[PDB]
Copies of this chain bind each other. A is one copy, B any other.
Amino acid sequence: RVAGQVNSRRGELLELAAAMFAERGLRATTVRDIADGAGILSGSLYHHFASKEEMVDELLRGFLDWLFARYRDIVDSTANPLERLQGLFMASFEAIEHHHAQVVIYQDEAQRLASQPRFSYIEDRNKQQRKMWVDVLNQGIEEGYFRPDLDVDLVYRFIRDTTWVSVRWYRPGGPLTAQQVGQQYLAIVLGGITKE
C-alpha cells in the first residue's frame, strides 16, 4: 500500500501519514496531527522519524523507487516500442490504484519541494522518465509503429498529463478499476498515435 515500505510499524505510520497528507495537504498536517491519528505521543512518533520532511522524503522515495523499478521491468521485458509504450502507460494506473496517496502527494507537493537539496532526486527522476518516454516514442516512429511527424515532446507531455492527472477524479470505491480506466485511455491514445 505504501510503495517502498514493508508491513513494519514504521510502514504502518507512514501509511497513516500519507493518507493524512493526501487528504489535508502537507502544510496543513503536523507531527502532532499524525501522532493523534495513530493514538501515540508525538515523542513516540519521533522514535521513527526525525521530522515531517523526513516522512515525506521516505514516502516519495519509496513511491519513485517502486515506479521506476516497474518502468525498468517493462522496458526490459517488452519486445517492441508499441508493447513497451502500452506497459509504461498502464503503470500510471497501477500507481493510482495501489499507491494513491503517494501519487496525490507527488502531484500536490513535488514541484515545490524540488528546490530543496533533500528532494534533488525529484528533478533527477523527472528527467529520467521524460527520456524514457522520448526514447520509446522515437523508436516507435523510427520503426513505423507510430505516426511519422508526431512531435515527440508534445506527445510525451500529452501522455504524461492524460494519464497521471486522472488521480484527481478517480475514486477507488467507484465501479471502474483504475486498470479499466487506463485501458480505455490507452485505446484512445493508441488510435491517435499509431500508424495506419
**Cβ of B157 and Cβ of A169 under 8 Å apart?**
yes
**Cβ of B161 and Cβ of A166 under 8 Å apart?**
yes
On whether A161 and B161 interact (CB within 8 A), knowing A191-B192, A193-B188, the answer reads: yes
User: Which of A36-44, A68-76, A179-187 forms contacts with chain B?
Assistant: A179-187
A interface, size bucket: 20 to 34
Task: State how many copies of this chain the complex holds.
Answer: 2
Is the CB of A158 closer than 8 A to any CB of chain B? Answer: yes
Is the CB of A114 closer than 8 A to any CB of chain B? Answer: no
**Cβ of A158 and Cβ of B188 under 8 Å apart?**
yes
**Cβ of A157 and Cβ of B161 under 8 Å apart?**
no
Is the CB of A54 closer than 8 A to any CB of chain B? Answer: no
C-alpha gap A101/B176 in the complex (Å): 34
In chain A, positions 145-196 with a C-beta closer than 8 Å to chain B are 147, 151, 154-155, 157-158, 161-162, 165-166, 168-169, 176, 181, 184-185, 187-194
Chain A residues with CB under 8 Å of chain B are 147, 151, 154-155, 157-158, 161-162, 165-166, 168-169, 176, 181, 184-185, 187-194
Give me 25 A-to-B residue pairs in the complex whose CB atoms sit less than 8 angstroms apart, sorted by A's number.
A147-B191, A151-B184, A154-B176, A154-B181, A154-B184, A154-B185, A155-B188, A157-B166, A158-B184, A158-B185, A158-B188, A161-B161, A161-B162, A161-B166, A161-B168, A161-B169, A165-B165, A187-B192, A188-B189, A188-B192, A189-B192, A190-B192, A191-B193, A191-B194, A192-B192
